[PDB]
Amino acid sequence: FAVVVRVGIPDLQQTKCLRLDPTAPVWAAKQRVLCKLNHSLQDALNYGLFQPPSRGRAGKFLDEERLLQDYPPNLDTPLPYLEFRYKRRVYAQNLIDDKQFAKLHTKANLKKFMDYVQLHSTDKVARLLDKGLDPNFHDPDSGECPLSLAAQLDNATDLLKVLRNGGAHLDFRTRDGLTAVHCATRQRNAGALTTLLDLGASPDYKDSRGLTPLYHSALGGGDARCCELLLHDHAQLGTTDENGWQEIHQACRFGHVQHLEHLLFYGANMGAQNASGNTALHICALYNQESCARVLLYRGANKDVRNYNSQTAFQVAIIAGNFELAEVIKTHKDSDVVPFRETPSYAKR
Amino acid sequence: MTEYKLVVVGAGGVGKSALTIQLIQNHFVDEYDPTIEDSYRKQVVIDGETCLLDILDTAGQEEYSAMRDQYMRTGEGFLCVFAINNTKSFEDIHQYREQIKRVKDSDDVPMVLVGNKCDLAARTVESRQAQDLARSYGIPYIETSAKTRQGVEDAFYTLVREIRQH
Numbered sequence: 432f433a434v435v436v437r438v439g440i441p442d443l444q445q446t447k448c449l450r451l452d453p454t455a456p457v458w459a460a461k462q463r464v465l466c467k468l469n470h471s472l473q474d475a476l477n478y479g480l481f482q483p484p485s486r487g488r489a490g491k492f493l494d495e496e497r498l499l500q501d502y503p504p505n506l507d508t509p510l511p512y513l514e515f516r517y518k519r520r521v522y523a524q525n526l527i528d529d530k531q532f533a534k535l536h537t538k539a540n541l542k543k544f545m546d547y548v549q550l551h552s553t554d555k556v557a558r559l560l561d562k563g564l565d566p567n568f569h570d571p572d573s574g575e576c577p578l579s580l581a582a583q584l585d586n587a588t589d590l591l592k593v594l595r596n597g598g599a600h601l602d603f604r605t606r607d608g609l610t611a612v613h614c615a616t617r618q619r620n621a622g623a624l625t626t627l628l629d630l631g632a633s634p635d636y637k638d639s640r641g642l643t644p645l646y647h648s649a650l651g652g653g654d655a656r657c658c659e660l661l662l663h664d665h666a667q668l669g670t671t672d673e674n675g676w677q678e679i680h681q682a683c684r685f686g687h688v689q690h691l692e693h694l695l696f697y698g699a700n701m702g703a704q705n706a707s708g709n710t711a712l713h714i715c716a717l718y719n720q721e722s723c724a725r726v727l728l729y730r731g732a733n734k735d736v737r738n739y740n741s742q743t744a745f746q747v748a749i750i751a752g753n754f755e756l757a758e759v760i761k762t763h764k765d766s767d768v769v770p771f772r773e774t775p776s777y778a779k780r
Numbered sequence: 781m782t783e784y785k786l787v788v789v790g791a792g793g794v795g796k797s798a799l800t801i802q803l804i805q806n807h808f809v810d811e812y813d814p815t816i817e818d819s820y821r822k823q824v825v826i827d828g829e830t831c832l833l834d835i836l837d838t839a840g841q842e843e844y845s846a847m848r849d850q851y852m853r854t855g856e857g858f859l860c861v862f863a864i865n866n867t868k869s870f871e872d873i874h875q876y877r878e879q880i881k882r883v884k885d886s887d888d889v890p891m892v893l894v895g896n897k898c899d900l901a902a903r904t905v906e907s908r909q910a911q912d913l914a915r916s917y918g919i920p921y922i923e924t925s926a927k928t929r930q931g932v933e934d935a936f937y938t939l940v941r942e943i944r945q946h
């Protein structure tokens with residue numbers, strides 16, 4: 432259970448004592464800090480828990496997806512001490528003129544930098560980072576950050592590696608709350624997604640709404656390679672939206688049959704029900720997605736499940752006018768089911 | 781410039797958090813949020829001098845009674861807060877005063893006696909009894925209401941004045 436932690440917020444000139452749960456993700460502790468600060472900070476999602484530089488150690492941001500227990504507390508203080516800091520560029524073992532740093536980060540120069548990223552001018556980007564540019568910023572018009580923009584370009588691996596070596600945070604979110612991993616996934620940029628994961632970016636990053644990149648892929652459809660890449664890198668399944676739709680519910684509503692098959696192969700819970708009690712098969716019946724319903728039945732979905740309206744998938748299909756789909760459900764027999772031959776293998780990193 | 785460490789010391793639900801919010805954020809906290817330990821810093825001008833205030837809002841519950849020793853050592857002055865409606869808080873002030881003296885190990889520590897919830901109609905603590913207690917202690921007594929911001933600036937500024945004396 433939870434422990435008393437002192438969190439310092441230097442931007443607010445405040446300290447707060449929170450109970451934080453070490454057996455829960457850092458993300459969860461961050462949420463608790465944000466709540467108790469009733470006065471919302473600007474671009475709050477970018478603020479992160481921070482381990483202050485101690486003796487013979489450097490300052491580091493806590494990993495959002497890692498459990499809080501992974502960061503054992505400094506014993507220097509009577510209570511454990513963390514800070515809540517904006518995810519600014521870290522110039523570890525770097526000292527530069529305040530005005531020179533100010534000159535580097537002018538609106539014009541940040542726009543120039545974003546132009547270099549867009550033009551794929553890797554060497555010019557690297558030289559500016561070498562001189563101390565902080566890549567953790569937003570373009571005013573686009574709302575993109577350098578890393579999120581690079582993640583949408585072809586052959587982005589060079590830019591992504593250079594930006595990360597130059598201090599770009601992998602979880603820096605855009606004005607809309609999306610990380611670089613979200614952006615690569617949405618654009619179906621498999622090369623950029625693979626490099627982000629190779630660089631240590633988590634596959635479970637949450638957006639403003641709490642939806643992960645994998646969830647976005649299921650909503651988006653199209654080339655299913657990115658979906659598979661996330662799942663292969665141990666992306667977590669079973670994320671829900673406000674109405675309790677999981678990834679398979681979304682894939683089924685829109686007929687994204689390739690996304691569905693990947694999700695099912697990697698262990699998605701077929702019996703998960705949303706707020707209405709509808710399973711993925713109910714969703715197929717509601718939206719007349721016969722291609723998806725066949726996959727669900729074939730892989731062993733339970734067709735007997737009733738929603739909270741006491742309706743089976745079959746009954747939902749009939750009520751919706753999907754008579755051909757309903758006959759596929761009715762006609763199906765248990766002997767038809769073929770369980771997956773092989774269990775998934777996952778990426779080493 | 782000077783830095784003054786002010787510690788708000790008081791029983792649970794006495795208005796310590798509400799007083800601190802009024803001085804710093806100029807706003808009244810309606811709902812009941814229990815405190816463990818909260819710190820605020822503010823730049824103010826008192827008697828023609830600009831001074832940084834270090835304000836420590838402490839926990840009224842005995843659950844976090846462990847932290848009491850550390851904050852009493854660091855803080856230069858204390859605001860002992862009791863609710864005018866609640867008699868228990870008034871009686872608890874003696875314990876806090878003794879602990880401050882014991883940890884500080886000095887007869888003279890800057891202290892200010894605050895009676896909160898002045899606005900509440902049903903007052904179970906007379907002004908005179910509080911004034912008598914203040915006189916025995918040799919420190920000022922202020923009646924402060926966080927809801928109307930009445931005397932809030934006076935109580936904190938008075939304590940800064942007490943700190944200046946020693």
Ligand SMILES: Nc1nc2c(ncn2[C@@H]2O[C@H](COP(=O)(O)OP(=O)(O)NP(=O)(O)O)[C@@H](O)[C@H]2O)c(=O)[nH]1
Pocket residue numbers: 790791792793794795796797798799809810811812813814815816838839840841896897898899900924925926927
């Ligand atoms: N009318 C009135 N109500 C107050 C005043 N101060 C607090 N309250 C109300 O009564 C409750 C007690 O205030 P609060 O600041 O939580 O007490 P505290 O001094 O922080 N004690 P602790 O933090 O240890 O729980 C609050 O929920 C608030 O709504 C006050 O000066 N006047």
